[PDB]
């Protein structure tokens, strides 16, 4: 009542519309992510995309027409609480859930290839490699599931401070080693054939006392290129550190990110204050920033035709020119809002609204 | 009679089980452990301990049982006197 005194300053984006991108189709998967924070996002594989909702139903879509292929419900008694981002590989589609259940469906047949029980909620996107699918549950547990049928291989244990941010980080695969984040600011590497660590390096720079509010957990997927990996804690300290061991090649204080991309000798990211920014991977020199967007609750930036596509909670899809930043266009795609990360591949992008479900956007 | 009278208790109640273990020859600490702290002690001259156990259900007999222990001026027990009381009234 009297306590709604939030320090909220998100200016309406400057009206600068240059070009005319449009939409292709909507699908109305149903009541999906909604107000509940999650990581559900569509995935594209060979002109076929997939989507799901918090209720449990999973829909498959053909490209270029938005026509249904097969729809199933993974409910029975109650919502399955689908949390794991939808991923696809070979002849399988993998989805997590808050009920510690991982489902693997058989793509075209739409049949449940299997499901298995893990320790704790499986928020992170299941990552597939080397015949193993990795789950980073909400306990610090990192569990490897055999690709044939379930059969947990090893469960690496990580720490858990009791105020962590939601949305645990999925790991990445490089040269037989899985690089994974943590809820205490420490990036770990694990040998993904028996469950043995290689190096666990702490990158956070937290204070104390009031730090009870400062969490500094790394929930971003670490990216790997050549001999280096990159990491971003919640409260700062962007780090680029050697693949072989936890040797910090170069660090910067800014950090404070939840999604970033690297390509073309540069790094494009968004701060925790939605300040989209570009850096040079050489030593961490700032090429440019774009501070028009503050407290706007952005999403992951995706590359598309040399343009950084981002979203917001008000639904407006923004295009940013990769050359020093300028509002190429603003699209009133939906009034529901954009919370999940957009997907871009095969020269085509998809964004699933919080309730408006998957939206296909054209240039 | 007819006016209600509450039960009245006026001292530590002692049972024959703990009485039977008292034999002349212990010190203050031993008897204090065995029976309990005496509510009534003689404040004049010699040190005498009185274990009085008196009940009164209210308009019945006032049951009484007294046990006097006479200690010497050294801390050891000398004399015992266990009276079931009821000397008339």
């Amino acid at each position: 009542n009297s306590e709604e005194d939030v320090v909220k300053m998100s200016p309406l984006p400057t009206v600068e519309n240059q070009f005319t991108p449009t939409t292709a189709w909507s699908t109305s998967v149903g009541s999906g992510i909604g107000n509940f924070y999650s990581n559900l996002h569509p995935a594209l594989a060979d002109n076929v995309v997939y989507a799901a909702d918090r209720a449990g139903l999973v829909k498959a879509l053909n490209a270029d027409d938005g026509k249904e292929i097969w729809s199933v419900s993974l409910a029975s008694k109650e919502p399955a609480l689908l949390s794991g981002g939808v991923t696809v590989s070979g002849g399988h589609v993998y989805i997590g859930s808050e009920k510690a259940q991982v489902y693997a469906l058989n793509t075209s047949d739409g049949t449940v290839a299997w499901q298995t029980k893990v320790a704790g909620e499986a928020l992170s996107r299941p990552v597939v490699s080397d015949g193993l699918v990795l789950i980073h549950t909400s306990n610090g547990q990192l569990q490897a599931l055999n690709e044939a049928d379930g059969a947990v291989k090893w469960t690496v244990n990580l720490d858990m401070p009791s105020l962590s941010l939601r949305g645990e980080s999925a790991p990445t695969t490089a040269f037989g080693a899985a690089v994974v984040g943590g809820d205490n600011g420490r990036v770990s590497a694990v040998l993904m054939e028996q469950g043995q660590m290689i190096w666990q390096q702490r990158i956070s720079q937290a204070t104390g006392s009031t730090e009870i509010d400062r969490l500094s957990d790394v929930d971003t997927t670490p990216v790997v290129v050549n001999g280096v990996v990159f990491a971003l804690a919640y409260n700062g300290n962007l780090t680029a550190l050697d693949l072989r061991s936890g040797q910090i090649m170069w660090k910067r204080e800014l950090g404070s990110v939840n999604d970033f991309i690297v390509d073309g000798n540069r790094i494009y990211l968004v701060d925790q204050n939605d300040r989209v920014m570009a850096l040079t991977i050489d030593g961490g020199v700032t090429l440019w920033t774009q501070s028009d967007l503050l407290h706007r609750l952005l999403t992951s930036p995706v590359l598309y035709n040399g343009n950084l596509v981002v979203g917001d909670s008000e639904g407006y899809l923004h295009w940013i020119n990769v050359e020093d930043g300028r509002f190429v266009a603003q699209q009133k795609v939906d009034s529901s809002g954009f919370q999940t990360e957009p997907v871009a591949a095969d020269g085509k992008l998809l964004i699933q609204a919080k309730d408006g479900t998957v939206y296909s956007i054209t240039r | 009679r007819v006016v209600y009278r509450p039960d009245i208790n006026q001292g530590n109640y002692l049972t024959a089980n703990d009485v039977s273990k008292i034999r002349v020859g212990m010190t203050q600490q031993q008897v204090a452990y065995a029976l309990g702290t005496p509510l009534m002690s003689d404040p004049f001259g010699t040190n005498t301990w009185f274990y009085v156990f008196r009940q009164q259900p209210g308009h019945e007999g006032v049951t009484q049982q007294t046990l006097t222990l006479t200690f010497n001026s050294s801390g050891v027990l000398t004399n015992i006197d266990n009276k079931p009381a009821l000397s008339g009234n």
Binding site: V7, S138 | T37
Partner: protein
């Protein structure tokens, strides 16, 4: 070289020589070497300084001193969820207060504390800023800026890991709320840190009391969105499996009370394991031991569990300890009531073995007297001998009565004088005294009454009263009564007494009821015109019985009270009659803290004559007003007087004296029955600082009264007064407050169902019990 003397600058909290005692330089004596740095360090180690600057411009120590400021005032802006009282209490507990020195470390200390408190409440986007404004004479003013952003909202409670119960059923019992119903505004979805521990223990209790013994909480996580708006709670449980009671074994240094302990531990074979059941078993064993004297036992239970047959054996270890004797009983707080009036309500005699039930029984009995706000018992061990204890009762005195003396009306309308004293505790003596006298032209009234509740030391009470009425038609009545009462048992009381009254009334109005009473008595004067007189005297014996069991004495919140009073005339008086009245007030609590109460009140009354003589009309029953169905009038419900045709009679002025015609005036029958139900709620506009003195209630009331004498002839064309089947009803809201002038009751009651000649009212104010 050598320094001749010292000079200082600041002398606020440190005297001239106060600092000299600490500094090791010891001027006026030997002194030299860089050691002056050590002197600076020693001076600052005291903490009574903010800056120091030694200087040797001459041969004397010129010590510039900037002392730490003393705070001038404390003030703060923006606090909404936190009240000023809590902040000032914390500051008093933080070592900072007006007139006390300021240290910058406490600034960061309290900043961290306040930020942590807001993070516990849920305002994660909050920051407290402390600003110090300097003032002349080395003092500061402390301002606090609170940027309370927004409360985080809880999103879901997830009980992942359960396979035997519904998650919704499990989280229904939780104090924290997943989704507040749309049709509920009193509840919200704030996240309080203590509530998480509370409902974790609630879930643990839920599984422990349904046969699940091999149970534990694996982990709990409190996730937070990167918006500080969503709080997610996750708990991991190990379901375990159900179990059955193999048996119970009670062993240890049990006292001679082993048999009843064994009976208490008798458990039906084939029952399901309940943690609440074993806790109740332990509490019952402890209470049984404490009743017989052992106030400090030791009871423990190890449930040795075998998974092969899923059977749990309860092994109870009990150590009685030593019996405890009360050395002495002390009373605190009775600044007015003497020691005997407290000590005589005790049930735990001094110099006896401690009966832990008797202490609380005496506390209840003291609380039932009605003139003690709060009573607190404390059985504290003596610092000396092992088996001794002192029992302390702490009471807070309460104002009891009022002295009033007021002249009213006047201004050519008539002097309305009144005076009185009404005490239940006369100067703490324990007496109940009451005197009341009113003097006005129309009527004069006087009465006096004195009652000693403890005339003898058993509970016997002796009381007496005198009363006098005389006024104009004329009416005089005066009399005297003396009664005594004694207790039958812990609760019941029985009273008997006797008294005589004398009445004399003349020039009475003509109406059917009084003429009927006179014809019964044997006098049949004229009816149309009235110039008659009558005298009577009554010697009567009265009796009574009261059963009282109440939590307190002023608006109790438990138990019940019944009160029966009956008076019968003795042969030899002018009139012969008997009256029997009954009252019954019962309270039932529904809330655990005894805050919400349902009240059932009832009153019954019968009265008639003996030997063919009618009951006198000057003592009939009445209704209405307060203390009954409220909202109609004072003494108007029931039979209405009907007058015979008027004649020369008395002096009848023109434009005045406008009195068988039916009139709305009432006379009251001889059979009464009223009842009422009330719901009690706390005042929604105050806090606990006053909540012990204000009571708010919603009430429904029903009442009826009728005359048992019926005429087929006279009442042929008039309403059936003798018919009881017709009732009066009302409902409304009531507010009571223990005002500094005594108990005051306000009521608003819309007349629900009334009859002719009621003149029902809406607002009603009353003083008294």
């Amino acid at each position: 070289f050598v320094v001749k003397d010292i000079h200082f600058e600041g002398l606020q909290r440190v005297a001239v020589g106060a600092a000299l005692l600490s500094m090791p330089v010891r001027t006026g004596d030997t002194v030299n070497d860089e050691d002056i740095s050590n002197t600076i360090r020693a001076l600052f180690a005291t903490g009574n300084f903010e800056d120091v600057r030694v200087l040797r411009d001459g041969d004397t120590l010129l010590v510039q001193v900037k002392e730490r400021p003393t705070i001038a005032s404390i003030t703060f802006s923006g606090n909404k969820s936190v009240k000023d009282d809590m902040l000032k209490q914390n500051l008093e507990a933080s070592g900072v207060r007006v007139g006390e020195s300021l240290d910058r470390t406490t600034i960061a200390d309290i900043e961290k504390g306040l930020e942590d408190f807001y993070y516990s409440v849920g305002k994660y986007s909050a920051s407290v800023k402390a600003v110090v404004t300097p003032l002349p004479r080395n003092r500061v003013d402390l301002k606090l800026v609170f940027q309370e952003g927004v409360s985080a909202e809880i999103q879901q409670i997830n009980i992942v890991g359960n396979h035997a119960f519904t998650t919704d059923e499990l989280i229904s019992h939780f104090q924290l709320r997943d989704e507040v119903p749309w049709w509920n505004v009193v509840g919200d979805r704030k996240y309080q840190k203590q509530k998480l521990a509370g409902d974790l223990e609630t879930l643990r209790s839920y599984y422990l009391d349904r046969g699940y013994a091999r149970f534990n909480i694996d982990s709990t996580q409190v996730s937070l969105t990167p918006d500080k708006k969503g709080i997610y709670v996750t708990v991991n449980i190990t379901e375990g499996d159900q179990y059955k009671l193999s048996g119970v074994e009670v062993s240890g240094n049990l006292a001679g009370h082993s048999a009843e302990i064994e009976q208490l531990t008798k458990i039906e074979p084939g029952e399901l394991y309940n943690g609440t059941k074993v806790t109740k078993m332990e509490d019952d064993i402890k209470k049984l031991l404490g009743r017989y004297g052992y106030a400090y036992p030791r009871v423990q239970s190890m449930p040795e569990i075998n998974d092969a047959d899923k059977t749990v054996k309860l092994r109870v270890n009990v150590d009685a300890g030593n019996r405890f004797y009360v050395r002495k009983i002390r009373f605190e707080g009775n600044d007015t009531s003497k020691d005997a009036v407290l000590r005589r309500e005790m049930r735990q005699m001094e110099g006896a073995w401690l009966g832990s039930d008797l202490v609380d029984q005496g506390k209840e009995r003291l609380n039932r007297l009605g003139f003690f706000e709060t009573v607190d018992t404390d059985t504290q061990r003596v610092p000396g001998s092992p088996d001794q204890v002192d029992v302390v009762y702490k009471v807070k005195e309460r104002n009891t009565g009022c002295f009033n003396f007021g002249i009213g009306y006047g201004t050519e309308s008539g002097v309305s004088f009144q005076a009185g004293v009404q005490q239940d505790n006369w100067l703490g003596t324990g007496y109940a005294v009451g005197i009341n006298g009113t003097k006005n032209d129309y009527q004069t009234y006087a009465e006096l009454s004195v009652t000693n509740p403890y005339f003898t030391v058993d509970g016997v009470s002796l009381g007496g009263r005198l009363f006098y009425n005389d006024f104009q038609y004329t009416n005089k009545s005066y009399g005297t009564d003396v009664t005594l009462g004694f207790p039958i048992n812990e609760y019941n009381s029985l009273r008997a007494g006797l008294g005589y009254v004398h009445n004399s009334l003349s020039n009475m109005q003509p109406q059917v009821a009084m003429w009927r009473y006179l014809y019964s008595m044997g006098e049949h004067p004229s009816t149309s015109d009235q110039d008659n007189s009558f005298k009577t005297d009554d010697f009567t014996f009265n009796y009574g019985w009261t059963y009282n069991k109440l939590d307190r004495g002023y608006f109790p919140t438990d138990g019940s009270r019944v009160n029966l009073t009956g008076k019968v005339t003795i042969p030899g008086s002018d009139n012969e009659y008997y009256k029997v009245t009954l009252d019954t007030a019962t309270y039932v609590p529904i809330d655990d803290d005894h805050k919400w109460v349902v009240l059932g009140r009832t009153r019954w009354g019968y009265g008639d004559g003996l030997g063919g003589k009618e009951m006198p009309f000057y003592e009939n029953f009445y209704a209405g007003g307060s203390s009954t169905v409220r909202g109609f009038q004072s003494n108007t419900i029931g039979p209405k007087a009907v007058y015979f045709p008027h004649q020369a009679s008395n002096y009848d002025p023109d434009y005045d004296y406008e009195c068988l015609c039916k009139s709305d005036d009432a006379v009251g029958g001889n059979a009464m029955a009223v009842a009422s139900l009330e719901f009690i709620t706390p005042t929604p506009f105050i806090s606990d600082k006053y909540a012990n003195s204000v009571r708010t209630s919603f009430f429904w009331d029903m009442g009826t009264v009728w005359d048992t004498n019926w005429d087929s002839s006279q009442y042929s064309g008039y309403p059936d007064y003798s018919d009881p089947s017709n009732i009066r009803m009302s409902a409304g809201i009531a507010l009571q407050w223990m005002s500094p002038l005594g108990p005051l009751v306000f009521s608003y009651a819309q007349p629900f169902k009334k009859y002719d000649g009621d003149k029902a009212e809406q607002f009603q104010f009353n003083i008294g019990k």
